[PDB]
Every structure is written in structure tokens, then in C-alpha cells.
Amino acid sequence: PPAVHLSNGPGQEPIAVMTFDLTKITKTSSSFEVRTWDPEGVIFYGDTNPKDDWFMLGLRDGRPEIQLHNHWAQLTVGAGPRLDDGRWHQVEVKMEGDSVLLEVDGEEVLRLRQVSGPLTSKRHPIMRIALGGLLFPASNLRLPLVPALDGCLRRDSWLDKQAEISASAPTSLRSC
Amino acid sequence: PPAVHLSNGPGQEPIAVMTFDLTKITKTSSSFEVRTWDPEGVIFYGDTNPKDDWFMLGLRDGRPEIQLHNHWAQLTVGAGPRLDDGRWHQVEVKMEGDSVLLEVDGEEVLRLRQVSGPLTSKRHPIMRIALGGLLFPASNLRLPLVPALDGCLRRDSWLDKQAEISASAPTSLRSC
Ligand SMILES: C[C@]12CC[C@H](O)C[C@@H]1CC[C@@H]1[C@@H]2CC[C@]2(C)[C@@H](O)CC[C@@H]12
Ligand SMILES: C[C@]12CC[C@H](O)C[C@@H]1CC[C@@H]1[C@@H]2CC[C@]2(C)[C@@H](O)CC[C@@H]12
Ligand SMILES: [Ca+2]
Ligand SMILES: [Ca+2]
């Protein structure tokens, strides 16, 4: 299975950005496998607005961390086991009603409840997903961390491929 | 080791309430072991103000759930494995800087960051801890649940015993 490096060069920007049309979404889940020895960094970021409607899944002290900022909630939460042990880990993020669920290696490790309304029914119908980086300065995070994540990603599926509008990459993706 | 039932009668109120003087606190951690087959309910509640400075640790769908409401954050978060398997489980809740940490059976399963300033340096210097129930109607929770927790508690330590002002129990505690 083809795998890509989650950091390019200095690791100051995402390795890829995908844009989706929220009105065409019929699937909200995203899943992938990640391998790394890096204890801190951004796995993926998402927003419909970089100022007040954004989300970030990363690692801090080797463990998953989600920072989220929208009309309903603003939080910085760590959960789950360390993933920086150099082993492949299955990760899944999805919506379940008004909640965001995080599953690691088959187990639910975190459920952020009351954080969102239906996606398709959101104001701005365009969602951006960035891999290995944010779409705003790391210093503007609720809790800053250094975004560079020295790791590999494979078997990824992002939201609903049928709603994907476009995909870009500042620089060509590197294979692991 | 002596153990007590976490629910008395209809399970509409806590089995015990302890009050502490925050200025005398030198230890914030609380720990105990719990056993139960009940998937939903309140393990313990805490506040300095039932309207806008409160906290609740309970179970929903068998898993830990924390609801917290204060000047800095307002959240409803689920995390960790199910604990309603009828086996004894070690649980520890403590402050680590501005974060609230939750450990289950020796493992950190949840860290709510940026949710609080130093306790000793809080406005109202009195904190109440209630076991097996809340100090306000369940309907006023951020996300209501039925508080009755049919389970047993033992080996409990609450905050700093040297700062404990008093302890009450609506009805006499029952042994498991
Ligand atoms: C977590 C989700 C959904 C599951 C999907 O698998 C990944 C995306 C990333 C973007 C999140 C969105 C949930 C809703 C958010 C928090 C909006 O309020 C602002 C950014 C959005
Ligand atoms: C979680 C803590 C601390 C660890 C201790 O072991 C238990 C108590 C319960 C009460 C919490 C407090 C943390 C600060 C809170 C959220 C205040 O803002 C309002 C209620 C307080
Ligand atoms: Ca890193
Ligand atoms: Ca119950």
C-alpha cells in the first residue's frame, strides 16, 4: 500500500489541500493509517473558515490532540494512547449527530459532544482539508505546537470523494 | 477494603457531599476504584458555584464522560474504555497546570487543556464535591443523563483532606 511523508521540506505548510462541496456530502468520516516516532505535530486540519470555523487533529506528547473552534465550541483536548511508537495505527474521525468521534486502532477513544450541527446544513458550503499542516499560522492555534509531523500516511479516505472539488499540493508528494 | 454503594434509594441525590477550603489545598488529585454494570450515571460532581463553576464525571454508554462549565470552558466530552464490565477500575482525576487529566487503570485517557487557573487562586474559596449525584437538577446539565449510578466505590481520596471543611450524607452510606 502506497504511503506518503506527512512533512515536506521544513514542514511549514501542508503537503496537500483538498476542497469539498458540503452540499454533496453523504459521508463525513475520514480514515487513514499513520506511522511515526514524532511526538508533536499536525496530522490534518479542516475548516470552512480559518478564523472561526476550524479543526485540527495532531499529536502532542505522542498522543492525539484535537483543537476545534466554531460557533458552538472552542476546545483543546488530548486523548488516546501514544502513537509515536513507530507502528502503523488506524485512525478514524467522524460525525455522529452533533458529536465528533475519534477512533484509534478500532477503539473509540474520544467523543466531543455538542460541537456541531449537520455539515451539509452549514453556512459556507465549502470545506478545506489540509494534511500535515494548518491553513493559518501555528501561533494562532488555541494552543500552539510545532506543526511539522515527521511520519507516514497511507490508506487515507477523506470525507466524501464525490463531494471533492479539488486537490492541490505546494510541492510534489514524497513516498515513504 | 470497605466499599460503598454510589446510589441511595431512588438515586435522585448524592450519597455524600464534602466541602473544602481552596486556600488550604496543596493537592488537587482525587482517586478511587469503582465497580458497576450500570452504563449511565454520575460518579462525582464538583463546584464552587452550581450555576457557572461546576464539573461532573460520570458514565454514558459505559464510558467516562466529563461535563464542565466555568469562565474558561464549557464542554461535554466522552473518553476511555467502558467501565461497566463489573470489574474494579482505578480512576484518577487531577489538575496539571491549566488542564484536567483523567486516568483509568493507570493510563491517561483524557486531558482537557486550557480549562482552569490555579484552584487556590480562585474567586470563591469553597469547593463542594458530591458523590453519586449532582448539586443541581440533571436537566440543567449541558447534556442531561439520569444520575443514578448503580455501582460501588472504594479506596477513595478527595482533593486535600487537610482542606476538607465538612462532610454530609442525606442518608447513611450503605456497604457493598
Ligand atoms: C471533524 C470534521 C468532520 C469529520 C471529518 O472526517 C473531518 C472534518 C474536519 C473539519 C471539521 C469537521 C467537523 C465540523 C467542523 C469542526 C467545523 O465546525 C469546522 C471544521 C470542521
Ligand atoms: C476537576 C477538579 C480538580 C481535580 C479534583 O480531583 C476534582 C475537582 C472537581 C471540581 C473541578 C476541579 C477543576 C476546576 C473546576 C472545573 C472549576 O472550574 C469548577 C469545578 C472544578
Ligand atoms: Ca514534530
Ligand atoms: Ca444508571
Side-chain angles (χ1 to χ4, degrees), chain A residues 60-61 63 65 74 76-80 108-114 142-143, chain B residues 60-61 63 65 74 76-80 108-114 142-143:
Chain A
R60 193 190 300 271
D61 306 299
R63 304 177 189 265
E65 175 179 285
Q74 307 83 38
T76 303
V77 175
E108 180 176 325
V109 301
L110 176 72
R111 181 170 305 220
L112 302 175
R113 295 183 176 271
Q114 303 180 293
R142 277 170 50 76
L143 184 63
Chain B
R60 193 190 300 271
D61 306 299
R63 304 177 189 265
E65 175 179 285
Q74 307 83 38
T76 303
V77 175
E108 180 176 325
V109 301
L110 176 72
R111 181 170 305 220
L112 302 175
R113 295 183 176 271
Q114 303 180 293
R142 277 170 50 76
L143 184 63

Side-chain angles (χ1 to χ4, degrees), chain B:
Chain B
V4 56
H5 284 78
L6 276 177
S7 53
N8 280 324
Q12 295 175 53
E13 40 181 44
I15 59 171
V17 182
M18 297 163 280
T19 62
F20 303 79
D21 175 333
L22 256 28
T23 70
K24 291 184 177 178
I25 292 184
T26 66
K27 165 180 178 290
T28 73
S29 77
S30 295
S31 55
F32 54 86
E33 298 187 334
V34 62
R35 192 171 58 178
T36 180
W37 293 105
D38 198 342
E40 181 168 309
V42 177
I43 291 176
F44 84 84
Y45 163 102
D47 75 20
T48 66
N49 187 308
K51 172 178 172 179
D52 50 40
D53 195 43
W54 62 265
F55 169 103
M56 181 242 275
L57 169 69
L59 296 177
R60 193 190 300 271
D61 306 299
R63 304 177 189 265
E65 175 179 285
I66 286 176
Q67 280 185 48
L68 171 160
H69 183 103
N70 62 31
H71 178 61
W72 304 280
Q74 307 83 38
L75 54 87
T76 303
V77 175
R82 295 189 71 104
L83 304 186
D84 62 347
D85 58 357
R87 293 192 294 79
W88 280 113
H89 292 283
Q90 175 192 57
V91 177
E92 176 165 45
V93 180
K94 64 185 180 184
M95 289 294 279
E96 185 55 49
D98 67 15
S99 306
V100 170
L101 280 54
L102 171 68
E103 302 180 311
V104 175
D105 293 330
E107 301 298 328
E108 180 176 325
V109 301
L110 176 72
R111 181 170 305 220
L112 302 175
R113 295 183 176 271
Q114 303 180 293
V115 302
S116 179
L119 295 183
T120 56
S121 305
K122 290 175 59 62
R123 291 172 170 172
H124 195 201
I126 297 190
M127 181 172 289
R128 307 184 294 166
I129 297 298
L131 303 186
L134 316 174
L135 292 178
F136 59 69
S139 67
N140 297 319
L141 278 171
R142 277 170 50 76
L143 184 63
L145 47 64
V146 180
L149 203 283
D150 199 325
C152 297
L153 176 90
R154 70 182 190 178
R155 291 183 49 184
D156 56 321
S157 180
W158 302 97
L159 286 160
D160 194 331
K161 194 63 173 193
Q162 287 207 184
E164 192 174 312
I165 300 172
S166 66
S168 309
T171 45
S172 60
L173 302 183
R174 306 200 318 299
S175 180
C176 283

Side-chain angles (χ1 to χ4, degrees), chain A:
Chain A
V4 56
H5 284 78
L6 276 177
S7 53
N8 280 324
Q12 295 175 53
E13 40 181 44
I15 59 171
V17 182
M18 297 163 280
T19 62
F20 303 79
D21 175 333
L22 256 28
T23 70
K24 291 184 177 178
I25 292 184
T26 66
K27 165 180 178 290
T28 73
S29 77
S30 295
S31 55
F32 54 86
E33 298 187 334
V34 62
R35 192 171 58 178
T36 180
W37 293 105
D38 198 342
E40 181 168 309
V42 177
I43 291 176
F44 84 84
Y45 163 102
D47 75 20
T48 66
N49 187 308
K51 172 178 172 179
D52 50 40
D53 195 43
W54 62 265
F55 169 103
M56 181 242 275
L57 169 69
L59 296 177
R60 193 190 300 271
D61 306 299
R63 304 177 189 265
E65 175 179 285
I66 286 176
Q67 280 185 48
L68 171 160
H69 183 103
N70 62 31
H71 178 61
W72 304 280
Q74 307 83 38
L75 54 87
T76 303
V77 175
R82 295 189 71 104
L83 304 186
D84 62 347
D85 58 357
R87 293 192 294 79
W88 280 113
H89 292 283
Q90 175 192 57
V91 177
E92 176 165 45
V93 180
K94 64 185 180 184
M95 289 294 279
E96 185 55 49
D98 67 15
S99 306
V100 170
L101 280 54
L102 171 68
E103 302 180 311
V104 175
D105 293 330
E107 301 298 328
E108 180 176 325
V109 301
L110 176 72
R111 181 170 305 220
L112 302 175
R113 295 183 176 271
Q114 303 180 293
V115 302
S116 179
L119 295 183
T120 56
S121 305
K122 290 175 59 62
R123 291 172 170 172
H124 195 201
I126 297 190
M127 181 172 289
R128 307 184 294 166
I129 297 298
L131 303 186
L134 316 174
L135 292 178
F136 59 69
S139 67
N140 297 319
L141 278 171
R142 277 170 50 76
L143 184 63
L145 47 64
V146 180
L149 203 283
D150 199 325
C152 297
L153 176 90
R154 70 182 190 178
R155 291 183 49 184
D156 56 321
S157 180
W158 302 97
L159 286 160
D160 194 331
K161 194 63 173 193
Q162 287 207 184
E164 192 174 312
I165 300 172
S166 66
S168 309
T171 45
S172 60
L173 302 183
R174 306 200 318 299
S175 180
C176 283

